[PDB]
Design a binder for this molecule. Structure first.
Ligand SMILES: Nc1ncnc2c1ncn2[C@@H]1O[C@H](COP(=O)(O)OP(=O)(O)OP(=O)(O)O)[C@@H](O)[C@H]1O
Ligand SMILES: Nc1ncnc2c1ncn2[C@@H]1O[C@H](COP(=O)(O)OP(=O)(O)OP(=O)(O)O)[C@@H](O)[C@H]1O
Ligand SMILES: CC(C)CCC[C@@H](C)[C@H]1CC[C@H]2[C@@H]3CC=C4C[C@@H](O)CC[C@]4(C)[C@H]3CC[C@]12C
Ligand SMILES: CC(C)CCC[C@@H](C)[C@H]1CC[C@H]2[C@@H]3CC=C4C[C@@H](O)CC[C@]4(C)[C@H]3CC[C@]12C
Ligand SMILES: CC(C)CCC[C@@H](C)[C@H]1CC[C@H]2[C@@H]3CC=C4C[C@@H](O)CC[C@]4(C)[C@H]3CC[C@]12C
Ligand SMILES: CC(C)CCC[C@@H](C)[C@H]1CC[C@H]2[C@@H]3CC=C4C[C@@H](O)CC[C@]4(C)[C@H]3CC[C@]12C
Ligand SMILES: CC(C)CCC[C@@H](C)[C@H]1CC[C@H]2[C@@H]3CC=C4C[C@@H](O)CC[C@]4(C)[C@H]3CC[C@]12C
Ligand SMILES: [Mg+2]
Ligand SMILES: [Mg+2]
Length: 1393
């Protein structure tokens, strides 16, 4: 009874039938005033409860909030006085309408709830939310109509409720004012990111990002200028949530394998993030619905102009509806896209952090498979592939929806003829199936080859000094080139298959459209067909994305399910009688191989210093590692009471100052720091360093000697002040004086650690009498355990062994990475295109043009065939000639794509070859100054970007440009002056492009400079896992990674937002221009010719869309070319001396050994000082000489300068009358042999490590191995010589590694040989045997020995001593011992005389 209540008519058809239309007022006084109010009411309580949940604190009284409350209150007072006037009018003995009395009460109750909502919000972080703004917008849109009819009525006649009309006008004015005041948002004393504090109208258009883009345009950006991320998007929250879900899923899925890591990391990811997958799904449906509604509005508008007897308001209503629909669709799409992209960033960050966290606790048997380079791949290429699958996920289902709905409209117009089209769709299926199943395995092969290449590259970058000392560059260059060739061969086939898929996808719709009407027997269309082809053109991108993502997900899931390390063997009982107990323990390094340590049982009380001695390969370090628990238990248990401290045999040094390394995360003191430095005799050397204590060290202690590194490690261990100390040979690199001082001042009967228990493993019998108990290990088991005197009395093996024995100047090292500032130089473009090949470009451009001309000719043929040719064989031919054009355009887009694939690969090949070749020829300063993180980043991320992203962008751009050229040519076919409307549009589109490019490019560069500190930190942690796990400093080594990941996330999020800002601008501009063009033709409704206004609209839409796409394609191209620009920098680095020069020495150049220095001077860097000065000496023919000096004197530098690693700063060195500075580097480094101080071994097999040239047979290798005392161990191995060695030679002990190095140097049989501490970790027996071997083998040679053990140096023709780079004494050892000097005192300290 609506009519009875309002005393009016529900709806009159003739009311709007007149040219002037006016809907009934009571309809508006009801439905229009119900929608807005109800929305506010039935939504209010839920938001009230939400505000109640998040009630934390009250903000200050913002002037804006007070003003808005005052305005609402005055509106409420206006409603109240209107109600009072209504009551007064009704009091005059009359019957007022029900609506006139109910309305004011409804308005009063509404304003009251608004006041509460506006107030309650004061307690929330966002003062203006979507609720009120949407309510205001709905109220304005509803009240527009009422105002229209009311004012019309007033114009017709003033005899009405003028007071009512006036109060309604002032009320509508309040509503407009309130909305205006709402979009404003105060700084709310909030200096954080303005993302949180943002009005809804200012948050749907990204108006809060204008400041960053303005400052980027004014001046180049800076890392400090990017606002920090939101609280939720930090690393810790995602890490915790994903860790919980992944652990639950892994625990659930591990039980299945028991019935037999099967299938997970897809359920866990879905379960962790399933809110974000719902909002995007909801938005996609709305976007699609608006996408299908808009064409109907356009068709109705174009049909309006067909008849000239229509009304006036139809066109304006259609234009307004079109504008509103386009705006809403744009806003929904942008939001949907941003949601998809952000979840992509969240999942990437979670994966990276989880991978790093898992890397800390992997078992040895599982860590032997994944090295540093392989894992660095998983946290770069694989994780990035997962970032790219989120954008094309919902479009899978969305495509099927749009296809089905569009097909329905065809059936409406035509009949079952369109239906038959599904048959072709059925065929499209198996073809994709066969092509995809065939292309999946190629990605796996490519991933494996990339893993191998990076594994080789990392070790190459780590071992640069030995490569140069040995001149092994070309072999490794060829080794890398072969793998690159294999990888490119694999990638080519994948590119071809992608081209075939694209061809099929592009060809199918044309034949479908042809066969739609092919069946003549049977019985805007093309517009929808074209629309329908849009969701059926980008599917190949979807297919590639999910294939790559599936392979990545498989390889990560395999990695993350690795075995842990068992710890239920080392019981930490604080309540223990002593401090160490072994109940017949037996541990093994491998899973189930032979037990390295067998049947060990011993116990040592607290405060006892015991020494562990034995032969090479006995198993001492294995025992200490078992104590740490790095081996797999087999039988027994070990009880440990207290903490532990570790001093590894291979010293590990971090990056930073010496003070930071010594502290190792501890409160700085003064009464203990000084004591530690002085006791470890690290004081004199520290004084000589350029920066003193605050001197930068480097990545692996490159800027240090061996003794300095060992003493730094010992000082750190003694400063940390733990309970149990496990020293593994800490007095090997130092000489007699320093060793005696350290033993008498740090660890011994009277030292710093006089109370803590000490367990030291040693090879020298000098400090044995001052110990408490000694143990002699043999074959992994204890042979004899007793005190010094007892063992000597036993007359056992101990007696036999003893009888045989008797910023200021140079603090800043690493320079900050230089970031190009400004535009990208055209030289980069010229270089890249030149690599692809100029001729190849010509063939493609010509082919794509043929596609366009055919497209144009095909469209012209459509135009001719339409209109019935101005009113059946001719018709049959006209219908028939469509597959010619379709097949033509398909084969043209095939040749273009196919031809491009061959080119891009050839370019990626040339670029990588040039980069590798140039990097391999840099000096040592560049290698020691920059960490390996930057080089690895350039070798992996940029190469992957060049391989993958650039082609697609470049192919896409050429399509768009030719598209406009074609569209422009078609438009200019007629209406010649129409070309003018393009110029203002061109300027408008160019302007936004020349304002967003500056910020987009600089954000890209900043991202690729903040990505390396993540790789640079993952390499120094893996190398020092035992120290970290022994010192229990694990929780500290994760906050650094979290910070380093958050820094990169900060740049990535800001980049994605900038893309959205540009789109919402370009789409708005296109909407506005399209709407403006449509209205003008509406005004000219009487001057139209043959309704030509029909197509003038269709053309405008296509033009704007292509223009918008191009302005988006060009920006991407620039940001991706930045990657090639960053690659190019490492191609023009300073080079060393020429490898081979015109000056060529004759064969057998070194017929004798007559090295003769002459006042040699050398400095390591041009900024540092001189390390060698006044060196004048002579080496006689085939003379055995020995050089001995205190640590830091420079002996290693002296023997290093013979290989031209450092250019001479004055003076010259001659070898048989031929100055060294006049020959090629490979003309000298080739003829000499040297065994470096630090033994470094490559990966692969033992044979490859012995000679990576295949120039020797097996028999000579066996003989050389016998000569180096390695026959027993090698023969006892399962595989004779094909045994694999882990990276950095972790599969062998130090003694075996040194013996292997000696055996390797024993093969080249050169003329000049130099020893550099070849017996550092070798027992005296083996030392004597190898000394006899060297004496009997290198008789016809010149040998230089650098050994701190004077036993070997005793027999030599000349003995040289060094102190600070200056030779002090020189002469025969007998003369030096006879005359009281430094050598006599050194020998007396050694106790040999
Ligand atoms: N990381 C490892 N992986 C596998 N096997 C290993 C590993 N380290 C050592 N081994 C095996 O254990 C043997 C003994 O090594 P270990 O380092 O314990 O001996 P060591 O006597 O302490 O050596 P050194 O005297 O050189 O310090 C090796 O020869 C090798 O067979
Ligand atoms: N790569 C380097 N860069 C800069 N300075 C260096 C570098 N290597 C060494 N030095 C400086 O030269 C000093 C001597 O180093 P060097 O290795 O030549 O001494 P050494 O007496 O031969 O050592 P050791 O006796 O332990 O073998 C170092 O203490 C350091 O001050
Ligand atoms: C407040 C805003 C949103 C209103 C938007 C619509 C406005 C511009 C429209 C709606 C109704 C329109 C009026 C309808 C009828 C007449 C009578 C005619 O003899 C002169 C124009 C005049 C007076 C129109 C002026 C423009 C008008 C007021
Ligand atoms: C829907 C929202 C967004 C906008 C509403 C605009 C409405 C109220 C406007 C748009 C076009 C207008 C019409 C345009 C032309 C005429 C013809 C004239 O002789 C009488 C008024 C009349 C019939 C107008 C009435 C008001 C009108 C229908
Ligand atoms: C309402 C806002 C949001 C959009 C702007 C709509 C504009 C284009 C509409 C609103 C009112 C309209 C006018 C209303 C009345 C008339 C009188 C009629 O004899 C000729 C058309 C003319 C002159 C209309 C032209 C178009 C018009 C000005
Ligand atoms: C199939 C492909 C490889 C054919 C080659 C296309 C060439 C001619 C195209 C592709 C990308 C284009 C570049 C894209 C972006 C810019 C930045 C702009 O500020 C100047 C023009 C410049 C530098 C373009 C020059 C022409 C260009 C290099
Ligand atoms: C849809 C609309 C808002 C898009 C219009 C593009 C606007 C944002 C662009 C187009 C031209 C641009 C201006 C072009 C030139 C200058 C002069 C320079 O010294 C300061 C920036 C300034 C003042 C630019 C500011 C941004 C600008 C006004
Ligand atoms: Mg050892
Ligand atoms: Mg040395």
């Amino acid at each position: 009874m609506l009519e009875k209540f309002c005393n009016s008519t529900f709806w009159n058809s003739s009311f709007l039938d007149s040219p002037e239309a006016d809907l009934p007022l009571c309809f508006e006084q009801t439905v229009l005033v119900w929608i807005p109010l109800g929305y506010l009411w039935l939504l209010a309580p839920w938001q009230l409860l939400h505000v109640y949940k998040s009630r934390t604190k009250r903000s200050s009284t913002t002037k804006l909030y007070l003003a808005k409350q005052v305005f609402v209150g005055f509106l409420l007072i206006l409603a109240a006085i209107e109600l009072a006037l209504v009551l007064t009018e009704d009091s005059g003995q009359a019957t007022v309408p029900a609506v006139r009395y109910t309305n004011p009460s409804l308005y009063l109750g509404t304003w009251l709830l608004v006041l509460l909502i506006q107030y309650s919000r004061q307690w929330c972080v966002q003062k203006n939310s979507w609720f009120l703004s949407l309510f205001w917008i709905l109220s304005i849109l509803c009240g527009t109509f009422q105002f229209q009819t009311l004012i019309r009525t007033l114009l017709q006649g003033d005899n009405s409720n003028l007071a009512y009309s006036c109060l309604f006008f002032i009320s509508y004015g309040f509503q407009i004012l309130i909305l205006i005041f709402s979009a404003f948002s105060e700084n709310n004393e909030s200096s954080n990111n303005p993302s949180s504090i943002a009005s809804f109208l200012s948050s749907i258009t990204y108006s809060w990002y204008d400041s960053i883009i303005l400052k980027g345009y004014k001046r180049p950006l800076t890392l400090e200028d990017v606002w920090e991320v939101d609280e939720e998007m930090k690393t810790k929250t995602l890490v915790s949530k994903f860790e919980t879900h992944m652990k639950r899923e892994l625990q659930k899925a591990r039980r299945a394998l028991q019935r037999r890591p099967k299938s997970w990391l897809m359920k866990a990811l879905f379960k962790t993030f399933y809110m974000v997958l719902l909002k995007s799904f909801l938005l996609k449906l709305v976007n699609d619905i608006f996408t299908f509604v808009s064409p109907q509005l356009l068709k109705l508008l174009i049909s309006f102009a067909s008849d000239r007897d229509t009304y006036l308001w139809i066109g304006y209503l259609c234009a307004i509806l079109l504008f509103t629909a386009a705006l809403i669709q744009s806003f929904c799409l942008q939001c949907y896209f941003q949601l998809c992209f952000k979840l992509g960033v969240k999942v990437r960050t979670a994966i990276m952090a989880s991978v790093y966290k898992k890397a800390l606790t992997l078992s040895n048997l599982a860590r032997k498979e994944y090295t540093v380079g392989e894992t660095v791949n998983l946290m770069s290429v694989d994780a990035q592939k997962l970032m790219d699958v989120t954008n094309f996920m919902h479009m899978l289902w969305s495509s099927v929806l749009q296809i089905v709905l569009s097909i329905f409209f065809l059936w409406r117009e035509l009949g079952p003829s369109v239906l038959a089209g599904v048959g072709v769709m059925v065929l499209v299926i198996p073809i994709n199936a066969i092509l995809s199943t065939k292309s999946k395995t190629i990605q796996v092969k490519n991933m494996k080859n990339k893993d191998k290449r990076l594994k080789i590259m990392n070790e190459i970058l780590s071992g640069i000094k030995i490569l140069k000392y040995f001149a092994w560059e070309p072999s490794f260059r060829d080794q890398v080139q072969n793998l690159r060739k294999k990888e490119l061969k694999n990638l080519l086939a994948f590119s071809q298959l992608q081209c075939v898929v694209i061809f099929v996808f592009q060809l199918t719709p044309v034949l479908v459209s042809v066969v739609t009407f092919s069946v003549y027997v049977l019985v805007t269309s093309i517009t929808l067909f074209n629309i329908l082809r849009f969701p059926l053109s980008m599917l190949p991108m979807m297919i590639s994305s999910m294939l790559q993502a599936s392979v990545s997900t498989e390889r990560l899931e395999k990695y993350l399910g690795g075995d842990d390390l068992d710890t239920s063997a080392i019981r930490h009982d604080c309540n223990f009688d002593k401090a160490m107990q072994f109940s017949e323990a037996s541990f093994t390094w491998e899973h189930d191989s032979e037990a390295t340590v067998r049947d060990v049982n011993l116990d040592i009380m607290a405060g006892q210093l015991v020494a562990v001695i034995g032969p090479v390969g006995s198993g001492k370090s294995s025992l200490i590692s078992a104590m740490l628990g790095e081996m797999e238990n087999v039988h027994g248990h070990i009880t440990i009471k207290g903490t532990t401290a570790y001093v590894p045999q291979q010293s590990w040094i971090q990056n930073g100052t010496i003070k930071d390394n010594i502290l190792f995360g501890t409160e700085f003191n003064e009464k203990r720091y000084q004591q530690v430095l002085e006791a470890c005799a690290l004081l004199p050397d520290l004084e000589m360093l350029p920066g003193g204590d605050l001197a930068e060290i480097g990545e692996k202690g490159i800027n240090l000697s061996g003794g300095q590194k060992q003493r730094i490690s010992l000082a750190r261990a003694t400063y940390q002040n733990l309970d149990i100390y496990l020293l593994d040979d800490p007095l090997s690199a130092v000489d007699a004086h320093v060793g005696k001082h350290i033993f008498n001042k740090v660890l011994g009967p009277n030292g710093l650690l006089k109370g803590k228990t000490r367990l030291l493993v040693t090879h020298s019998m000098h400090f044995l009498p001052q110990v408490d108990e000694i143990v002699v290990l043999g074959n992994g088991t204890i042979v004899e355990k007793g005190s010094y005197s007892a063992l000597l009395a036993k007359k056992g093996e101990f007696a036999k062994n003893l009888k045989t024995f008797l910023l200021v100047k140079g603090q800043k090292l690493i320079k900050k990475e230089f970031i190009e500032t400004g535009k990208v130089k055209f030289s980069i473009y010229l270089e890249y295109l030149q690599a692809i090949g100029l001729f190849s470009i010509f063939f493609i451009i010509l082919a794509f043009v043929m596609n366009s001309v055919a497209f144009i000719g095909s469209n012209l043929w459509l135009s001719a065939w339409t209109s019935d040719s101005k009113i059946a064989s001719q018709r049959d031919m006209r219908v028939g000639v469509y597959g010619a054009l379709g097949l033509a355009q398909g084969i043209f887009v095939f040749i273009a794509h196919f031809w491009s694939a061959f080119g891009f690969v050839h370019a990626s090949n040339i670029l990588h070859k040039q980069l590798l070749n140039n990097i391999l020829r840099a000096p040592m300063r560049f290698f020691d100054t920059t960490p390996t993180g930057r080089i690895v980043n350039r070798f992996a991320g940029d190469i992957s970007t060049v391989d993958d992203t650039l082609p697609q962008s470049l192919r896409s751009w050429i399509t768009c440009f030719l598209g406009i050229i074609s569209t422009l040519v078609m438009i200019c076919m007629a209406t010649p002056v129409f070309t003018i409307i393009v110029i203002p549009l061109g300027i408008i589109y160019v302007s936004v492009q020349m304002f967003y490019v500056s910020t987009s490019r600089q954000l890209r560069r900043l991202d690729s400079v903040t990505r390396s500190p993540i790789y640079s930190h993952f390499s120094e942690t893996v190398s020092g896992l035992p120290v970290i796990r022994a010192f229990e400093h694990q929780q500290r080594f994760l906050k650094h990674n979290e910070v380093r990941i958050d820094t990169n996330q900060k740049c990535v999020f800001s980049w994605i937002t900038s893309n959205r800002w540009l789109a919402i601008r370009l789409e708005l501009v296109g909407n506005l221009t399209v709407f403006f063009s449509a209205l003008m033709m509406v005004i000219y409704r009487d001057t139209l010719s043959g309704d030509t206004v029909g197509f003038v609209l269709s053309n405008a839409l296509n033009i704007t869309q292509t223009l918008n796409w191009l302005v988006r394609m060009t920006s991407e191209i620039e940001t991706n070319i930045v990657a090639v620009e960053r690659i190019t920098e490492y191609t023009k680095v300073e080079n060393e001396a020429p490898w081979v020069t015109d000056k060529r020495p004759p064969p057998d150049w070194p017929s004798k050994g007559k090295i003769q220095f002459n006042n040699y001077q050398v400095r390591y860097r041009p900024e540092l000082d001189l390390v060698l000065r006044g060196i004048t000496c002579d080496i006689g023919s085939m003379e055995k000489i020995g050089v001995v000096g205190r640590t830091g004197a420079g002996k290693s530098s002296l023997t290093n300068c013979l290989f031209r690693i450092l250019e001479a700063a004055g003076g010259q060195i001659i070898i048989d009358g031929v100055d060294i500075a006049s020959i090629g580097l490979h003309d000298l480094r080739e003829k000499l042999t040297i065994i470096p101080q630090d033994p470094i071994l490559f990966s692969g097999s033992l044979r490859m490590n012995l000679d990576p040239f295949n120039n020797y047979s097996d028999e000579e290798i066996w003989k050389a191995l016998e000569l180096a005392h390695l026959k027993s161990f090698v023969a006892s191995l399962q595989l004779g010589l094909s045994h694999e060695v882990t990276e950095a030679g972790g599969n062998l002990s130090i003694g075996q590694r040194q013996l292997l190095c000696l055996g390797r140097a024993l093969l080249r049989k050169s003329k000049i040989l130099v020893l550099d501490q070849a017996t550092a970790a070798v027992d005296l027996e083996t030392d004597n045997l190898i000394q006899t071997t060297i004496q009997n083998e290198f008789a016809h040679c010149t040998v230089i020995t650098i050994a701190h053990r004077l036993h070997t140096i005793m027999d030599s023709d000349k003995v040289m001593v060094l102190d600070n780079g200056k030779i002090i004494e020189c002469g025969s050892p007998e003369e030096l011992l006879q005359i009281p000097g430094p050598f006599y005192f050194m020998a007396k300290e050694a106790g040999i005389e």
